[PDB]
Amino acid sequence: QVCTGTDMKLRLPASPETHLDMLRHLYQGCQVVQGNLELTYLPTNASLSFLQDIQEVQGYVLIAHNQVRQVPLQRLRIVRGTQLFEDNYALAVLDNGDGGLRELQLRSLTEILKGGVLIQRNPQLCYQDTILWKDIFHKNNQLALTLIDTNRSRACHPCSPMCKGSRCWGESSEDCQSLTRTVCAGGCARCKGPLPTDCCHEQCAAGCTGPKHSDCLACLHFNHSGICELHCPALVTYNTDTFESMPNPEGRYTFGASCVTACPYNYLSTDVGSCTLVCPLHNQEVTAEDGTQRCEKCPCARVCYGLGMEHLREVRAVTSANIQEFAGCKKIFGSLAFLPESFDGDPASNTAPLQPEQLQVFETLEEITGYLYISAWPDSLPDLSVFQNLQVIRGRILHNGAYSLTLQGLGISWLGLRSLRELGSGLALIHHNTHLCFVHTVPWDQLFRNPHQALLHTANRPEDECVGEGLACHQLCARGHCWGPGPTQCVNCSQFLRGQECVE
Numbered sequence: 001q002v003c004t005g006t007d008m009k010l011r012l013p014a015s016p017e018t019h020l021d022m023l024r025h026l027y028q029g030c031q032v033v034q035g036n037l038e039l040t041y042l043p044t045n046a047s048l049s050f051l052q053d054i055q056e057v058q059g060y061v062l063i064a065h066n067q068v069r070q071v072p073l074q075r076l077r078i079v080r081g082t083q084l085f086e087d088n089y090a091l092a093v094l095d096n097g098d099g100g101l102r103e104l105q106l107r108s109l110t111e112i113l114k115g116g117v118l119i120q121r122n123p124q125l126c127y128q129d130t131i132l133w134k135d136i137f138h139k140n141n142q143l144a145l146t147l148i149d150t151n152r153s154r155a156c157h158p159c160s161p162m163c164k165g166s167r168c169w170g171e172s173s174e175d176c177q178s179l180t181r182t183v184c185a186g187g188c189a190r191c192k193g194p195l196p197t198d199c200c201h202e203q204c205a206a207g208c209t210g211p212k213h214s215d216c217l218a219c220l221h222f223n224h225s226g227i228c229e230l231h232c233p234a235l236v237t238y239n240t241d242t243f244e245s246m247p248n249p250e251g252r253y254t255f256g257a258s259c260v261t262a263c264p265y266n267y268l269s270t271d272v273g274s275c276t277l278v279c280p281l282h283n284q285e286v287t288a289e290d291g292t293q294r295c296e297k298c299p300c301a302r303v304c305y306g307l308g309m310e311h312l313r314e315v316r317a318v319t320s321a322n323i324q325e326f327a328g329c330k331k332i333f334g335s336l337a338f339l340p341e342s343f344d345g346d347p348a349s350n351t352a353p354l355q356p357e358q359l360q361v362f363e364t365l366e367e368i369t370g371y372l373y374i375s376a377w378p379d380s381l382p383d384l385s386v387f388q389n390l391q392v393i394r395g396r397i398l399h400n401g402a403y404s405l406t407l408q409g410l411g412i413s414w415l416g417l418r419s420l421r422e423l424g425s426g427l428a429l430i431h432h433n434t435h436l437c438f439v440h441t442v443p444w445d446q447l448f449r450n451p452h453q454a455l456l457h458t459a460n461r462p463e464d465e466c467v468g469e470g471l472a473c474h475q476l477c478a479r480g481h482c483w484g485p486g487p488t489q490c491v492n493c494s495q496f497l498r499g500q501e502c503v504e
Contacts, residue, residue: 003032004035004395004401006040006062011339018430018459019042020048021455021458023048023051032256033059037060037073038085043068045069051072056080056256059079061092062091062093066100069101069102073106076109084115091116094122107178110177112138116147117147127170130163132165157171188202203222203228231273253292263275265293266425269292270296271296274295304325304326305334307335308370318336335398336370337406338359338373356380356381359381367393368392371398375406376409379410382413382414383412383414383417385416389418393405393426398425403426407428411435414438416483423450427456430457438483441471474487477494
């Protein structure tokens, strides 16, 4: 399956302790990173058991402020450069340990289409200077600012003697870094290794079992039913006998680097045969009965854009200046978040403080194509009643690249977000909110749309205390499982459907 990666920059940690639960759950079973990736501020001993699962990166990779000794993202293969880190880097590492990372082991991560590498002093991390970044940068990627900081606090074990060119992401032979550019003999765009024999079909992306397009492991172009072409077999082709158009029985959509007859949830099928997360200019959304979402050429509707999009690419949190961009639409094509700075605004610009009464603007927000992140929230609100109708979070863009929903350090006593059973991509994070219950009372078992979610909880109210209060779900509820107190907070109404109403 597919999920986004993280996006921290200078953002508030949501919860080092709960980041652990989050990362395991998000990555588990995820082969593809949507957008970017950034792992920061994790606990020294976090059990990040699923990070290795993901095979692809679309945006930048940051590791910073991270006390974790190991962050095992070993399968990541290519970086498509969809967004750049602080608009310039494909990868970055910063202050990753006061604890701290020893090695990254990103053995498969061989390609950067856009972006440089920004590394600062890493007290525990080594082997970042044993990477042939020159090779990693794509043949046509000249946006390759490279800064390798070898300022460390420890002795470094030599790079395994078993690595070609002693190129590695750690001291073990399991950490050897593959070379896919400087060995592209014959002038091929990308290769698996030295000589034309080991060039990849030009549709491939630094990973193939050979020169044929049926044999690509990763693609620049797209794997239609596993086979790479510049573009997918045209959705509509034509008959050269008359040269008139006709539907192509083999027509497919460029789903990320893959190509399909129908796109898995949250992907947008264009009429040029592509499957994006983001609509190209003048491409309107339509949703198919099979879950394929579309971005077909316009004669265009008005679209409200959230954080991470267009002129809002600069902001990862909502401020007062963003009110008119994020309001008036039932869905936001992008993300929204409530950070201490969202509430503080910008004292330097003499702005007004956020008024809690304006958070009711999301009452009709059925869908977020991005994220909902709250780290700052009025304590006058015991729950998220303003988001109860938020049935869908697509997660094309996630806060901190992970959160479909963040509730950290809040005054809310329950979640109460009755309709959010459709999580296209991402995780909720519950942290430092010792007033919160129902974390383990919602029948999460039946509320997931993909395998990227599981039970998460740190520094929230202990269930033992919620139990001490005599808390339980109302008898109207099947299984007794709910999101808040009372019969309306249950995932269903188990009794009689009589015409217009559910009654006991």
